[model samples]
Target chain A: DNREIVMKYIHYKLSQRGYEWDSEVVHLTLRQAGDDFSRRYRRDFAEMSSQLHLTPFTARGRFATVVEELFRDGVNWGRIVAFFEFGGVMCVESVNREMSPLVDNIALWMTEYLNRHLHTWIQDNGGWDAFVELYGP
Target chain B: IXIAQXLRXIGDXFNXYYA
Candidate 1:
């Protein structure tokens, strides 16, 4: 149930943003990548805050767009998976700065990227069912 | 599918910031 843990996290971030469970639907593959990337990265995630370059205002509107441009030339599993880690990195900084609204922005942007960009790729890879077999029964 | 089932159980210290 590796995805069980990741899905729980998706729900938690939604809660932080004042969104309830089911307010948005995250593809299961995305959730797994999120959990996977969070673990793969280290304490250095904080050090890379330089990559964020977001304000509470900017993030509220542009996070999805920012992530989109990252893969403008070549989109793949690695970069898509990195959004999960990237989002996590931003979330930790939001908590650190006590800027709660930024957390909501991060959550909102996550769903946007899921919808705007990652939808097709996820389906191409066999949707949620693919990872269901990869990680569990 | 197991996601919502664990909803009541998911959380962390970050909750206080906005949650």
Candidate 2:
């Protein structure tokens, strides 16, 4: 869609700007490419962060912080799972505070175990950095 | 036909056999 819009814009600019249209086309293409790249990079980071949140590891402290920030604040486990399953197959809307604390504890334990035992693979592939960037500042 | 039932059976068997 970006490319299509850019091409269309380029064509329109050509007709309107006439003669100086080449420079405009180049500028628009660069802007489009940068915008697309930034969007994708942010998206990729979010995905990585989400995976890390669910990933089992020893980083209990970090994971707890992450959950407190992203999930416990409101997102919670069921909603996250619902979004992943994409059909609310997990019946996320039914989850309540009574259910949330247990899930939070489980998240912490899982993060601790995974980080300690699976560090090689978990840390090797971009890991938390990718997630942080994706999650924004 | 429910996976939950199958899992329960397996768990029961394991507990019985192990205990």
Candidate 3:
């Protein structure tokens, strides 16, 4: 009950901002920053996860997949940024910190992976039209 | 290896990236 209202508030606030709300992660990515990859790519990602109720446990899993792809592909090398939330705690970081080899490898992969997938994730989950009606984009 | 450097940079690079 309370969660629904909070979700609604998120939708309402998103609408007021002249942006649409999207329960689907894909639409959120599009509204997050149009087509300009540079701005959107580096935007704090943890906050994005929080909005979706994807706890840190889920994010770590997701992050790992993303990072794995980056290392394998050797694609872009720009910085990756994300915010992490768990319980009531939040952490944000750019992909420039020292981490254990395993951790470092994962981060490297995620940095590039999210940049490529975020836009498509929006399209596949829900197009802008459906997204706006639900939340407002 | 790189992680160590990354940790150092995290400490040094941003003036207050966290604030």
Candidate 4:
């Protein structure tokens, strides 16, 4: 509910700025980013899981695929942010919701950081209208 | 690798900002 509101506001704000993006491209870019993240962090996740006793929400090889499934039909920025937010939440949950000074901090920070960068990419590539053309019904 | 570096930059900023 709140996420939809944020998504609407972001869409409005980006529309005013004359930035347009094709949803297909945005989806592809997001998928690529997730794929890269999963590949790069494969070992890191394993080590973190073992050291911190934190199991992943998905299996080792399926992280990117699971995240990609969230963006299936119409890729909205809200859903994109939600996907990363879910990852952060999973990390936090793994530690019994205790806020660690380092690991949990980075998990949460990275979610928002990635979200901001994704927004910037959309603006740089194109804006809401183009996104609607591909994502809208 | 670029994304990893970018995320590292974010982590660095967080470290500099707080604990």
Candidate 5:
């Protein structure tokens, strides 16, 4: 119950920011960012897994697939932020699932997809600032 | 990552882009 609330609020605050971006740009940027994400968190990820049990990811590709679907559907300020939350959630899921090996792959795919697809538009919707403002504290 | 706790970590990915 409590875990779900945080999950809900995380996305709620994310959507509340309202920066907006192209669907493809949002996806591509986070893909690369997600790669960088896991490396930095690798050392600390074990401790971080304690509070993450809301959404269960059963496979490695789920992260890439779900993110692809989200931005592919449409882009917005909230959705961009949700992308990060998705990254965080998936990383946690990886730890919980005892699939740390998949974590690196997930981030790689994120970087790959985002960088290859919508970099052109990445500059138009206020760039990563949209993500920072939405996901940043 | 928790925004309140891990926002700093995710923030650096902001550097992932050259543009």
Candidate 6:
């Protein structure tokens, strides 16, 4: 019951963000990716931080502050998930535009995970046509 | 799902401590 409610909320959030996909599939994929990231961090948080050219604790702490602010603003976990997944992609794109290797491997890995899993689902659903229509030209 | 949430919380906690 709770799962269904969360799934519905995720779907609604996706729609608001101009995405359309099976929310259940997206939910499962995000969970898997999140778990994978968590596991990787547990093994060697310092290494992951170094790869991103960031202090592990500082970077995560900054994100946490953002997350807390979102929570205080009444954002739910499902929406938070969407924010991280999609926002991470945009971050990668911005870094890419600078034509610099500033983005670390760990960040690339995370963005790739979202692209391979989440964006691929969007592509399969209707290719870029569907995306451009909803997300704009 | 719980693991994911916990992970986020843990990261957030560390950040809260730092800044």
Error of 5 at A17 (Å): 24
Error of 4 at B19 (Å): 39
Per-candidate TM equals: 0.56, 0.22, 0.22, 0.29, 0.44, 0.26
Q: lDDT by residue for model 1 over A1-137, one digit each (tens)?
A: 23343345656555555655431233544565456444544443444575556567766544555464555554444555555556665665676666656766666667666767677876888765654554331
Tens-place lDDT digits, model 4, residues B1-19: 2222333433333323323
lDDT, candidate 4, A38-124, per-residue tens:
354454444333333334433232334434444434344444434443354344443444433333343433445446434565566
Candidate 5 deviant stretches above 4 angstroms: A1-60, A130-137, B1-19
- What is candidate 6's lDDT per residue for A11-48, written digit by digit as tens? 44344445543433444445444344335356543333
Recovered native contacts in candidate 5, as a fraction? 0.00
Lowest summed lDDT window (length 10), candidate 1 chain A: A20-29
Question: Considering summed lDDT, which 10 consecutive residues are worst modelled in model 4 chain A?
Answer: A1-10
DockQ preference between candidates 2 and 5, better one:
5
Candidates in descending lDDT order: 1, 5, 6, 4, 3, 2
Question: Candidate 2, DockQ to 2 decimals?
Answer: 0.02
lDDT of 2 at A1: 13
Task: Name the lDDT of candidate 3.
Answer: 0.32
Q: List runs of model 4 lying over 4 Å from the truth.
A: A1-62, A97-121, A124-137, B1-19
What's candidate 6's i-RMS value? 9.9
> What shift in Å separates residue B6 of candidate 2 from its native position after superposition?
19
Better of 1 and 6 by lDDT: 1
Separate DockQ for every predicted complex: 0.03, 0.02, 0.02, 0.03, 0.05, 0.07
Better structure of 3 and 6 per lDDT: 6
Q: Which regions of candidate 1 deviate over 4 angstroms?
A: A1-7, A10-36, A43-46, A51-53, A60-65, A132-137, B1-19
Kindly report the root-mean-square deviation of model 3 from the true structure over all alpha carbons.
17.6
Report the lDDT of model 1 for residue A4: 41
Q: By DockQ thresholds, what CAPRI class is model 4?
A: incorrect
Model 5 Cα lDDT, one tens digit per residue, A1-137: 11232333333323344411112343444444444554555655454445444333444444545555656634554444445555656544565566555545555555564566545455677676566554432
